Amino acid sequence: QAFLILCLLSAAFAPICVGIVFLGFTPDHHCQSPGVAELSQRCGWSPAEELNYTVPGLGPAGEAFLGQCRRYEVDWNQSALSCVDPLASLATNRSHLPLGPCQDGWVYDTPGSSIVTEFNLVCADSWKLDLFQSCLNAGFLFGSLGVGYFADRFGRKLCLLGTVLVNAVSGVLMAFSPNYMSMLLFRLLQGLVSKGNWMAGYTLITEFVGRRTVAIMYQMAFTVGLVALTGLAYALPHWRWLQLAVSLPTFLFFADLFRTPRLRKRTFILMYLWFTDSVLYQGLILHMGATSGNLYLDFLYSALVEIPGAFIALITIDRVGRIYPMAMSNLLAGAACLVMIFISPDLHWLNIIIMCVGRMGITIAIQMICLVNAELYPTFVRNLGVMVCSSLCDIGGIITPFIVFRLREVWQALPLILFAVLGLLAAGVTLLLPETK
């Protein structure tokens, strides 16, 4: 039963970004109006009428921020008793009427209640969610550093058991976070211990079994854990429930790499390629989490289309080569992103087709570069180089939400333009690497 424990760890690594994708799914949050709600319940009692009358939806050019944070209430309550147009008592023009800030609670039209429902990160504090994911990725960086330090400090078994216990306790207590600062601290510690524990588990899986087929099986177990996480999240929406029920399964018991000019360029290229691969992966996953109204089934398809990509990679490691399939995969990802920005209102089936093609390309690129990294670097500083490249991977993970949630608010097209430019540049730059194969 050696493989079952590793598969369970892989499943426990699912909520890394999928955690904030499912938990951070922001529903249509309209700020609560005291007078309007009472009158609507008294006479209207219609969700469509309440949505149309509580907030001003007249947002030119698709701007919903004017209606996602404003009540535009003139304290009409039920005095007018029109029930067809309560806002007509003050003025006919809904947008021209003054709208004070909605500092009160927000109403989230969802049978479940995500993190935004229980923490009021509705519209004015979206950078709080961005900072949440950024703190998770900074936790990965500092946790790689701490895991290296602890491995150099005590050992490979006491550190492993300690970080596994820390991960289990951090998840369980993060399911019981009263305020936002405690949730942030627990997420930081969770990132630390999760990065360390996954690194240790992958190293043990690839070392104690003696094969790359075992690593492929580990990635497949990660995908299976992702599918199980999506299936479990669909059954129970609440974020506390999901966090508790995904943390419970875990609880069962030289630095001079820039010296050689020939090697410095290769290190720079590999760093940039992986960096942009992690950025594209997290960006597409968060985009799917923040644009789909059927996120459960869409995300299930996205997770299920990962394993044909893994099979293609396992077939093409020895067939295509080591540098040629990288450029093709990145160019395919860039073309897919361009089609996404060109086919947003064309067809949703076309949208999911392009999405799964892009995800397959990203998976191919990530697996190939993970192989190449360990393949080319010399044994003296292989770990060092892995840590150095993971540094920029964590930098990209930090940057990704702070750019996605800062550019989407002003225009929908900017994140896709940025992703396509990054992918095309990666495809055009990764072909200058020497013969890794």
Ligand X SMILES: CN(C)C(=N)NC(=N)N
Q: Which residues bind ligand X (CB under 6 A)?
A: 219, 281, 366
Query: At 108, phi and psi to the nearest 5?
Result: -110, 110
Shortest CB 303 distance to ligand X, Å:
12
Q: Which is nearer to ligand X, 151 or 371 (CB)?
A: 371
Q: Which is nearer to ligand X, 15 or 56 (CB)?
A: 15
Shortest CB 433 distance to ligand X, Å:
21
Among all chains, which residue has been given the structure tokens 């398809």?
301
d(CA 167, CA 154): 18
Shortest CB 8 distance to ligand X, Å:
16
Query: At 159, phi and psi to the nearest 5?
Result: -60, -40
Q: Which is nearer to ligand X, 26 or 390 (CB)?
A: 390
d(CA 3, CA 345): 45
Strands of 151-280 (E only): list them. none
Shortest CB 223 distance to ligand X, Å:
9
Count of CB atoms within 10 A of residue 428's CB? 13
Shortest CB 13 distance to ligand X, Å:
7
Q: Which is nearer to ligand X, 31 or 366 (CB)?
A: 366
Shortest CB 50 distance to ligand X, Å:
40
Shortest CB 39 distance to ligand X, Å:
49
List C-alpha distances in Å: 181 to 2, 128, 138, 170, 186.
Answer: 38, 11, 16, 14, 9
Q: Which is nearer to ligand X, 189 or 366 (CB)?
A: 366
Decide if 69 contacts 31 (C-beta within 8 A).
Answer: yes
- State the residue number with the nearest CB to ligand X: 281
Decide if 214 contacts 206 (C-beta within 8 A).
Answer: yes
Q: Which is nearer to ligand X, 95 or 391 (CB)?
A: 391
Q: Which region, left, alpha or beta, applies to residue 315 given φ > 0 means left and ψ of -120 to 50 means alpha?
A: alpha
Q: Which is nearer to ligand X, 217 or 366 (CB)?
A: 366
Tokens of 83: 């029930």
Among all chains, which residue has been given the structure tokens 């104690």?
208
CA 253 to chain centre: 29
Q: Which is nearer to ligand X, 54 or 219 (CB)?
A: 219
**Nearest-5° Cα angle at 428, 373 to 413:** 105
d(CA 61, CA 64): 9
d(CA 24, CA 405): 12
Shortest CB 366 distance to ligand X, Å:
6
